[PDB]
Automatic annotation (TrEMBL), chain H:
Coiled-coil annotated spans: none
Residues represented out of the complete protein: 1319 to 1496 of 1497
Recorded name of the encoding gene: EFCAB6
UniProt-recorded name of the protein: EF-hand calcium binding domain 6
Organism: Bos taurus (Bovine)
Highest taxon of the lineage: Eukaryota
Residue stretches making up the EF-hand domain: 117-147
Length: 50, 28, 43, 429, 428, 35, 156, 178, 215
């Protein structure tokens, strides 16, 4: 593995649970975390014809 | 000191002994 | 330009370093640490 | 990332490991087959600490089981989790030591150490960046105490900058399980002082009392003692397998605790130990954690504080707890008991808080403590050894196996100067 | 433009930034994925498709706390290589983070710093967040400052440090890490803010009705202070203060740079009904010794300067009334050689409310920045704790055994002795 | 000494591109100032 | 052979020079003006300047296979004029021994005596032939104003 | 018990290093430090112990017999001992007065640091034997601030290395301190 | 992945034959600009926005920094170090959303830096190419949909290290005539290896002769 890279087991993981009533509620997920929020991917726009 | 194609040789810091000898260039 | 008098050994012994600055809050921090310190209260 | 290669030498080491791997696999959601059925994704993010990958998505531990006789490993294999180990990691010979440090160190361990060194070189180099090893054994036996220190002596020269922990079971003051136990103890302590960065002293009737009084079990088993040792060994390495609000690995606990490279013998402890009928008679908070943590009836050693002074204390917490409460409890426990903590170290408690408790508990804590009163273990061992050795009580079962009286003399003088050094740091301005 | 780069080093820095950047995103309307559903230009670089990337380098030697940023809700906001992790942590050792472990990760951090600085035309200064207790938050955060001071020259380097608390602590080797990092704080920084966790615990216990608080509330308060400091580079104001313009009025001498932040309205929502949060009421709350973020009474010393940073519905006609009221009383005693002693900054954007937070939404606020002599007693406790342990050389073999000479412990103490003498002699 | 990221990658990096087999990102840009 | 005395331990062979001297007849010690803690010497093949408190050597300058009949300083320590036997007068720097200049054919035999005027301008020399010669020393050139002719033997 | 006093107030009146000091300058000055005295002891301890046929009395040999062991009598059984790995020295010795003086000057340091000093003797090229090299011996001594001059090291090595073998036993050197 | 990247590089060269551009270069103009002498015709190749879809959409990819991505000493696609060689002529091919002043500013930035060394007999030192068609993403590939792309064909002195390696790797083998009998047996004679060796020694010395400055 490279030095400043994520692990393969952490690159595709859901993390902890944001609900405090769950057993696996991390402090981060209960503090900074939202349910029913799906993030989006970016894009790049522009061409030379423009 | 390592011996060859053993797990102690492919190690961050190892010294590998060479092959023993040959037969010629010396009298029989 | 070169002189013979620079061939004289010299060292000029450095003066001893001045004593370290002990603060004016040392008594206060000593009493602050020594307060609330009972012996054998829970154990 | 940060992997640990776990070694278990002797009957005590094998029987401790058979419960340690069960409790770890239950903590990481691993069935007896070896597959993964975890309910949360945090249980597999750091599974490379203890488990290696196999074909078909199977997880095998980084365990090396060492014994001079394969007798205990039939019971290890026939247990509930005996089939999760790779069969190449079992190392065994033809005859046993017979409670002889000399046999398992010189005559019978000298030809069995090579295969163990090969298997730990193969297992240690299948890792991304190795943090350290880990040994579980007992100081009263012949194989786990004779071979168990030859293993550390050989491993340390190959890996001089890693972590060597030893969850040793030290001899017992009231009654023993081996007649020749003082000889094995004084010989193994002389190796454990030089060759280890952290050593944990665990006494048997400390565990017996804990089970009989703090747990109130009518009929215990050695399985319950092994469960206690496994729980107090899993909680030390719980901050490098789960996230938390303050992290501390083995090296952070080593740096914060030992002030000099000799005083590395510690007192384990597990704080949430409820009774069999008195669960409803408590309101689970952090003050009860601290009170049962620092109670001298709750240590895992027959030697006590209140006869000496704490040098450094560790406190690894698990669960969702507030940090002001933890900090104020550790401030109060040092302020209100100002005679059992040394005065030349302003803060003697290192705290670490993880987030995931053991399954079934709400909070948890794990005491680790460096005391100047560990020396009465060594004083009693030296008194028993000076009773036996002066009249050559059992020396002919050692000197005829290629030993010399000088080795016992080093083993005694080193422990005696360690006692003297603990006395010197016991009282100081 | 008026861009700034945030450098977050260690667990304390990363967990501070997890609240700081949530506050910034909620201030500028940016969603957690970086896309809104020119005020953002100082913290966000705008890729041409509505994507805003923070100008932050989250740095740690341990791969645990950063991996929650990578798997949390904010995973799409950050660049993947702005979050740099190592393999082994420093294990509360200054020598490890400064000579052994951090030497193999420093240059990647400098590479990302150069990447962020190239995109910014007019760079105001850096914002560095760390703690004095840990290993990578002291050793690596002192090597990186030296590299940045050599490379970037005259740019401002503000630092927000977590000083050790006077009574309570969390590690045994905290005096050793905090003494050794005093040289780079003294020489390789332009403004060195200090806070300690016990003062913020007292604030969160008394001013907020929160029994059992945690680190999240402390980080939110620190994020509020750092938002009010940099708010005049984003929103319009009556009297805008720049990162340079408060430095010429706060530090008298090149060695006297140790202000004390103070956020005045810190009240929960059910105590805000009975309080009229006026400008004069929040102005004299900044001078009460129960609200400083370092446990030191300002009555023991003399104020030397002030930078009063207002916010919201503030008109300059009552700031002067509050200042005159402050100057009336003789408890707040100022210095001989500075008659004015006040810098007033007025912005207009009111502070934002973080959902899940405890602070009430207020129309007026002020961050007080003061260079008072009373901070010199925060060093005397560390001095006593150091020479209590260094009397017979405890824990020295860990530091010496990794590339650190024995004599560096004494000079880092002589530096603090000279700094203490310079700070205490200058008030009288 | 570096006013640009290109001079950070060039000049002061000790990575020889002819005798450097399969280095990663963290070892290309190792500087003389680090040693 | 040349007068050195060493003390070297038998383990790993580290030597220590403890005594230095000449190895021929020495002549014409000359003291610097004012100070008394240094002095200079001359002999066959060697010109050495000694510390006089601890009796050690600071530097040596060598013209091989020759003998120095006499030396002299100047008013301020800019040079050491020396009267070698080869008919040459050589001037060295007071330390590092760099050759400042040379007077090639000073006398038909070696120069025996030497002197120095206080203005650092005139050097008086006398050869084995009997000639007393005054020499002009400039910044760039070294000239001969006049050779004075009375003696019928070498000038002591 | 007063060995530092009888050394500091004997090296000042010593005219030149090895030169000892005559009779009454000892007999009157053992009353200075109030040593237990008797004329019968005085006669033999002065006249019999003047080992150069002069009036001067050898201070170094007498105080060497007083404080430094160098000759064990095994102190009967049932008595715990300290150095355990001795008698690996092939009967070497010169025993000059300067050897005793060097031993006495080094004495207050070794007794303070010999429990960690013996283990750095061991970890530096032992194997199990009990013999170190001279250079490693000097390196180990310097790491505990025992600094020996050239004369001091000559007189040390002339007693523990007679055959010029460049190997020195460290237990037998440490035996004449405890 | 290697073949896909090579396909992108080859498609960048023939981009001015199938698409309209601001300043287009055909294949005959690839030859009077890149090749100074009849033997020095071995230029390196590179691709500037080689970046995955997880990191492509975060940074804006303008002209002024993907021009630096071609002169980086670790982006070159032959294992020769440009820092031990002086450039002779570079052929920059830009495609996508490129405006001709951004190329000018980036090239001036390259010429200001004193680390990138050019020969004294070539003051111009560059060949510009701008096309309006962005590179085509391939589904299942590794590269991302990027609106700018730069391919640089650089003729450098620095390639004299690789042929100095090839000559040594023939030096090792040919001195024992290893594997020569597997080549002599099919219509070849022994003297043809020494012919290839002397031609490559001549090519090695030609780089030194062209690389030395003119007094
Ligand atoms: N205010 C605040 N301080 C914190 C927080 N987390 C840790 N700290 C402080 O950080 C100090 C210890 O350093 P850490 O941040 O835990 O660890 P580190 O800086 O990454 O250094 P190492 O872990 O040793 O590599 C403690 O004294 C705490 O006071 C936090 O979330 N908020
Ligand atoms: N905790 C624990 N201790 C054990 C167990 N089995 C043996 N011991 C202890 O180990 C000590 C001696 O170990 P021993 O059985 O001789 O190890 P051996 O040398 O491999 O035979 C005895 O005092 C026992 O009390 C066990 O299963 N659990
Ligand atoms: Mg950390």
């Amino acid at each position: 593995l490279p030095l400043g890279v994520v692990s393969p087991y952490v690159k595709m993981s859901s993390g902890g649970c944001t609900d405090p009533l769950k057993f696996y509620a991390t402090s981060y997920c209960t503090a900074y975390g939202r349910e029913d929020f799906k993030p989006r991917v970016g894009s790049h726009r522009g061409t030379g014809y423009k | 000191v390592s011996e060859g194609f053993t797990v102690k040789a492919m190690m961050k810091n190892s010294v590998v002994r060479g092959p023993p000898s040959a037969g010629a260039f010396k009298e029989r | 330009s070169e002189s013979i008098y620079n061939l004289i050994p010299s060292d000029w012994k450095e003066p001893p370093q001045p004593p370290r600055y002990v603060s004016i809050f040392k008594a206060t921090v000593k009493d602050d640490m020594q307060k609330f310190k009972t012996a054998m209260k829970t154990m | 990332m940060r992997e640990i290669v776990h070694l278990q030498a002797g009957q005590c080491g094998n029987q401790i490991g058979a419960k340690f791997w069960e409790v770890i696999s239950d903590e990481h959601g691993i069935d007896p087959t070896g597959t993964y059925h975890g309910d949360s994704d945090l249980q597999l993010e750091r599974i490379n600490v203890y488990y290696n990958e196999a074909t078909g998505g199977k997880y095998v531990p980084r365990a090396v089981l060492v014994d001079l006789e394969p007798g205990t490993m039939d019971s290890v294999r026939s247990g509930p989790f005996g089939q999760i180990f790779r069969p190449d990691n079992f190392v065994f010979g033809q005859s046993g030591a017979g409670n002889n440090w000399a046999k398992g160190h010189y005559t019978e361990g000298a030809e069995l150490v090579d295969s163990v060194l090969d298997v730990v070189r193969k297992e240690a180099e299948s890792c991304d960046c190795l943090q350290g090893f880990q040994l579980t054994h007992s100081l009263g036996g012949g194989t786990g105490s004779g071979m168990g220190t030859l293993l550390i002596s050989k491993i340390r020269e190959e890996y001089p900058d890693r972590i060597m922990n030893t969850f040793s079971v030290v001899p017992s003051p009231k009654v023993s399980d081996t007649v020749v136990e003082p000889y094995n103890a004084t010989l193994s302590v002389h190796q454990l002082v030089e060759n280890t960065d952290e050593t944990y002293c665990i006494d048997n009737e400390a565990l017996y009392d804990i089970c009989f009084r703090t747990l109130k079990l009518t009929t215990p088993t050695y399985g319950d003692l092994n469960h206690l040792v496994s729980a107090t060994m899993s909680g030390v390495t719980t901050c490098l397998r789960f996230p938390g609000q303050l992290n501390a690995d083995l090296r952070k606990l080593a740096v914060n605790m030992v002030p000099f490279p000799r005083l590395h013998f510690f007192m384990p402890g597990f704080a949430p130990l409820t009774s069999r009928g008195s669960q409803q008679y408590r309101a689970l908070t952090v003050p009860e954690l601290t009170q049962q943590m620092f109670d001298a009836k709750n240590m895992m050693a027959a030697c006590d504080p209140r006869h000496g002074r704490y040098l450094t204390v560790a406190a690894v917490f698990r669960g969702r707890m507030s940090m002001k409460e933890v900090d104020e409890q550790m401030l109060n426990v040092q302020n209100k008991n100002s005679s059992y903590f040394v005065e030349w170290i302003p803060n003697n408690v290192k705290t670490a808080v993880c987030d995931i408790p053991p399954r079934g508990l709400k909070m948890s804590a794990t005491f680790i403590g460096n005391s100047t009163a560990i020396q009465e273990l060594f004083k009693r061992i030296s008194e028993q050894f000076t009773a036996m050795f002066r009249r050559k009580a059992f020396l002919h079962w050692y000197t005829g196996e290629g030993m010399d009286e000088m080795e016992f003399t080093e083993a005694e003088s080193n422990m005696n100067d360690l006692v003297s050094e603990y006395q010197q740091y016991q009282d100081a301005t | 433009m008026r861009e700034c780069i945030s450098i977050h080093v260690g667990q304390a820095g990363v967990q501070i930034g997890n609240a700081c950047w949530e506050l910034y995103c909620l201030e500028h309307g940016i969603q957690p994925d970086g896309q809104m559903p020119d005020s953002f230009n100082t913290f966000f670089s705008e890729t041409g498709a509505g994507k805003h990337v923070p100008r932050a380098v989250f740095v740690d030697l341990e791969p645990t706390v950063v991996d929650e940023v990578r798997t949390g809700t904010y995973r799409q906001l950050f660049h993947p290589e702005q979050l740099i992790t190592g393999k082994e942590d420093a294990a509360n050792n200054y020598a490890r983070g400064h000579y052994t472990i951090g030497k193999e990760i420093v240059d990647l951090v400098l590479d990302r710093i150069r990447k962020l600085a190239d995109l910014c035309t007019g760079l105001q200064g850096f914002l560095i967040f760390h703690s004095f207790g840990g290993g990578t938050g002291s050793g690596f955060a002192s090597l990186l400052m030296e590299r940045l001071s050599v490379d970037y020259g005259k740019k401002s380097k503000l630092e927000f440090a977590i000083y050790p608390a006077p009574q309570v602590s969390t590690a045994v080797v905290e005096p050793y890490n905090s003494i050794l990092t005093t040289h780079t704080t003294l020489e390789h920084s332009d403004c060195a803010f200090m806070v300690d966790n016990e003062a913020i615990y007292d604030i969160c216990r008394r001013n907020l009705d929160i029994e059992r608080p945690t680190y999240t509330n402390l980080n939110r308060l620190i994020g509020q202070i750092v938002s009010s400091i940099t708010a005049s580079l984003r929103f319009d104001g009556a009297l805008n203060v720049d990162l340079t313009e408060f430095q010429t009025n706060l530090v008298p001498y090149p060695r006297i740079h140790f202000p004390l932040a103070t956020y005045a309205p810190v009240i929960s929502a059910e105590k805000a009904y009975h309080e009229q949060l006026s400008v004069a009421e929040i102005t004299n709350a900044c001078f009460e010794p129960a609200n400083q973020m370092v446990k030191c009474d300002p009555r023991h010393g003399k104020y030397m300067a002030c930078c009063m940073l207002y916010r919201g519905d503030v008109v300059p006609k009552d700031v002067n009334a509050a200042i005159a009221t402050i100057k009336t009383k003789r408890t707040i005693q100022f210095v001989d050689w500075c008659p004015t002693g006040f810098k007033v900054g007025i912005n207009y954007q009111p502070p934002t409310v973080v959902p899940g937070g405890d602070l009430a939404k207020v129309q007026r606020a002020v961050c007080m920045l003061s260079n008072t002599t009373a901070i010199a007693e925060a060093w005397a406790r560390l001095d006593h704790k150091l020479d209590l342990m260094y009397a017979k050389r405890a824990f020295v073999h860990w530091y010496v055994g990794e590339g650190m000479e024995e004599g560096e412990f004494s000079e880092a103490r002589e530096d603090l002795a000279a700094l203490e003498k310079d700070y205490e002699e200058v008030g009288v | 000494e570096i006013p640009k990221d290109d001079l950070d990658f060039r000049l002061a990096a000790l990575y020889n591109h002819h005798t450097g087999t399969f280095k990663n990102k963290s070892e290309i840009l190792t500087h003389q100032e680090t040693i | 052979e040349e007068s050195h005395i060493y003390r070297v331990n038998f383990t790993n062979f580290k030597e220590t020079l403890i005594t230095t001297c000449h190895f021929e007849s020495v002549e014409d010690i000359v003291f610097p003006f004012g100070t008394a803690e240094l002095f200079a010497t001359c002999a066959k093949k060697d010109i050495r300047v000694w510390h006089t408190l601890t009796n050690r050597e600071l530097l040596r300058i060598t013209v091989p296979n020759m003998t120095c009949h006499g030396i002299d300083f100047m008013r301020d320590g800019k040079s050491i004029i020396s009267a070698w036997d080869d008919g040459r007068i050589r001037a060295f720097a007071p330390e590092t021994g760099r050759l400042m200049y040379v007077i090639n054919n000073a006398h038909r035999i070696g120069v025996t005596a030497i002197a120095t005027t206080s203005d650092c301008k005139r050097v008086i020399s006398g050869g084995g032939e009997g000639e007393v010669r005054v020499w002009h020393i400039g910044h760039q050139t070294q000239k001969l104003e006049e050779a004075l002719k009375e003696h019928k033997s070498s000038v002591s | 018990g007063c060995w530092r006093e009888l050394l500091r107030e004997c090296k000042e009146r010593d005219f030149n290093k090895q030169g000892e000091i005559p009779g009454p300058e000892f007999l009157a000055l053992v009353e200075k430090f109030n040593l237990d005295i008797s004329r019968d002891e005085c006669q033999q301890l002065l006249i019999k112990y003047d080992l150069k046929n002069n009036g001067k009395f050898a201070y170094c040999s007498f105080i060497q017999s007083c404080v430094l062991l160098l000759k064990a009598k095994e102190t009967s059984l049932m008595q715990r001992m300290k150095i355990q790995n001795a008698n690996k020295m092939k009967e070497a010795g010169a025993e000059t007065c300067s050897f005793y003086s060097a031993l006495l000057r080094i004495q207050p340091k070794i007794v303070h640091c010999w429990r960690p000093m013996r283990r750095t003797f061991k970890a530096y090229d032992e194997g199990g034997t009990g013999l170190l090299s001279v250079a490693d011996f000097r390196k180990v001594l310097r790491q505990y601030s025992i600094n020996l001059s050239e004369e001091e090291f000559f007189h040390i090595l002339e007693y523990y290395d007679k055959t010029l073998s460049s190997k020195i036993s460290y237990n037998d050197f440490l035996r004449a301190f405890l | 992945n290697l073949n896909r990247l090579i396909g992108q590089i080859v498609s960048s060269i023939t981009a001015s034959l199938r698409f309209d551009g601001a300043l287009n270069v055909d294949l005959t103009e690839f030859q009077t600009n890149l090749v100074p002498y009849p033997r020095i015709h071995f230029p390196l190749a590179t691709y500037a926005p080689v970046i995955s879809a997880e990191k492509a959409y975060h940074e804006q990819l303008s002209v002024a920094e993907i021009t630096n991505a071609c002169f980086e000493p670790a982006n070159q696609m032959v294992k020769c170090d440009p820092r031990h060689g002086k450039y002779m002529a570079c052929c920059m091919l830009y495609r996508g959303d490129v405006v001709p002043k951004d190329v000018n500013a980036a090239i001036a930035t390259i010429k200001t830096k004193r680390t990138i060394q050019f020969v004294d007999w070539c003051p111009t030192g560059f060949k510009v190419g701008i096309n309006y068609q962005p590179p085509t993403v391939v589904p299942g590939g590794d590269l991302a949909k990027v609106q700018r792309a730069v391919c640089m064909l650089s003729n450098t002195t620095a390639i004299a290290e690789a042929w100095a390696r090839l000559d040594h790797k023939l030096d090792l083998m040919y001195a024992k005539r290893a594997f020569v009998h597997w080549y002599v047996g099919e219509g070849m004679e022994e003297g043809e290896f020494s012919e290839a060796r002397e031609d490559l020694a001549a090519l090695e010395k030609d780089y030194e002769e062209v690389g030395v400055d003119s007094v």
